[PDB]
From a paper:
[name], a nitrogen-fixing bacterial symbiont of legume plants, encodes an essential l-asparaginase ([name]) with no sequence homology to known enzymes with this activity. High-resolution crystal structures of [name] show indeed a structurally distinct, dimeric enzyme, with some resemblance to glutaminases and β-lactamases.
The zinc ion was found near helix H9 and the loop connecting strands B5–B6, with a tetrahedral coordination sphere formed by Cys135, Lys138, Cys189 and a water molecule (w1). The position of Cys189 is nearly identical in all the structures and is additionally held in place by an H-bond to the side chain of His139.
Author numbering:
A (entry chain BBB): 4 to 352
B (entry chain AAA): -3 to 353, 356 to 367
Amino acid sequence: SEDFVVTDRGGIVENSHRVHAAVVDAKGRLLYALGNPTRMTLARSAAKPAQALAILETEGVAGYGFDDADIALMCASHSSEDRHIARTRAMLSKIKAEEADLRCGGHPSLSEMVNRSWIKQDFIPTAVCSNCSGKHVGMLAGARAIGAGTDGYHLPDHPMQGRVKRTVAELCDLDAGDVEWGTDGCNLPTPAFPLDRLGRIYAKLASAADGSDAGEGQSTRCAALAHIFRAMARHPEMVAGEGRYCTMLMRAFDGALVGKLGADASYAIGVRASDATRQLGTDGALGISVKIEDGNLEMLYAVVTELLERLGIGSPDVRSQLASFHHPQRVNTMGVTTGGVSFPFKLRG
Amino acid sequence: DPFTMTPSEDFVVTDRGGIVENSHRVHAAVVDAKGRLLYALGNPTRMTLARSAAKPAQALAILETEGVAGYGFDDADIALMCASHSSEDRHIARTRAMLSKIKAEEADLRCGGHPSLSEMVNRSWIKQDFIPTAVCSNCSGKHVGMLAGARAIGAGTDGYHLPDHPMQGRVKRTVAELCDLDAGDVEWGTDGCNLPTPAFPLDRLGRIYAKLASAADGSDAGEGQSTRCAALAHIFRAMARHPEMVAGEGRYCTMLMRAFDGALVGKLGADASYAIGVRASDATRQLGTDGALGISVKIEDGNLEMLYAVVTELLERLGIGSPDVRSQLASFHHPQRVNTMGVTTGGVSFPFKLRGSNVDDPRLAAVAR
Ligand SMILES: [Cl-]
Ligand SMILES: [Cl-]
Ligand SMILES: [Zn+2]
Ligand SMILES: [Zn+2]
């Protein structure tokens, strides 16, 4: 099916971007789709909650005293704000590691205002500034916890990566051979699986949170999932930072969902049971996964907000906090409005 | 499967370890001097905002404005009228020099400042807290041309940028005439520099650039020319001789035009349009035309990195230049996919297929898409 977000200058088509989306229930049954909802998709940072699970399920990790903020950073593509780097350093301290132990590299900040601040001060970002720094410290913590040694914690043949590989396939309900692996910008293995399975991970996150809240019997696995949901909802500034879609989405909704960006314009949302989900004809939590085929971030945020509006997730009041993402500014160097965005797609049911 | 390939399948693709990351739809037209279509990718008649790729057509409207010759604009100045420049100091200085030649001030410009198209210029600006103003606009030189036009005909500099102004009437007609289109087949929006900007089928953008390179061939041959073909040959020559004014250091357009040493001109449009005018050569004759050639490209989704990759791939598929001319552009053709720890994690490939002249079954439709 033929689903585009379209940008226009004076009603004249500028760019068009192909949209894929899956809305799934708690068991990962497909409720709603755009484009191809099973598109083989690199989840990139959208997978970090599942990598966080592998760290949290590593024997001895509880001993380090990681708090909800720390777990939030494990789940983060953060903007590398001073407060992100400070929490990375404090997490290194809790496991008696140093920055030299990190196998991720510096890069320009995911926030242009942070990056401009760095440029002004001639600052060259190092390992500790990685958007992925919290995940790498988690991996160091897991490595040391089982006495596997911290050297090579990032390599596919290290037991930490064997744990991550198994945990991703389990959460997706996939055989090992159905998950493909490349290398991320931060130099860890990174999975690809059908986009609907990314929605399933986040439906299980939200369903865990629901199960915890309703005093139900839970595996250690569901209890860990609910703790990850809780940490992301509680400290959304650690997951992203000031002005970032994921932070403003999670603050607007105040514990009702979690949202996570993946690089090259993936998005995942886990939504707790609500009048909205019941309305959509499911009894449980749901998951939403989205890919912009061509990788455009600005179009991703526009489409995710349009999707929430079409699914009736939130009130119009809540969703209005995301107005500048939904209909991004199309204004020239002289303050004249030159065009906008349109959403000529229909959700299939 | 390889025998049922279609324009809808004309993609440039990025991979991580062989896994598809992003894919981008490509549209391209290759046309002769009269604008006959020789080769295509995707939909070569896609209605497309030319944006800055139309700047040579706006430069022609300025140069054919009676009295403009009086101001003493040189080749460097005309090159800046055709520019999307990086706002380097030499670009700002040249703009101020052009403002003096017409006795106008920075205050008469109706374009606004913006971040430099060059990361290196931007870094320098960030460092010194510099806020770009009108005179730094990538489009500054086009705007001074328009002012120059406005003064020469006695129209008033006030509103020179508005559709009702006779300078914008001249642009409107010149663009339709160069495209060989009725007015009603060219649509108009507003550009980032706050001028009218046209949209026409992608193949007519290639036709404009074919006419530029054709005029250059007629001039070099010492053929008698219309005022129009003489002016087009002057624009070609200005762009080819002063490619640093058209863009700047490190910019695809400058490096492409230096590499080819007068054999073609090339211009970026915002949101990933490109236009090339190729002078008659062995290459163009090999491609089955006895004159100059035009190429126009659009990435459907607007990705600029994929545009430079695709344009370089397409020059190589058309046989334009030596491998050794083209290899100044290797870093644009096959962009680096190196992670934060120096490890290559993937790259770009070009699963698209030139059509127009291998011969496929007459029953395989090639639907513009
Ligand atoms: Cl003509
Ligand atoms: Cl990378
Ligand atoms: Zn990472
Ligand atoms: Zn302009």
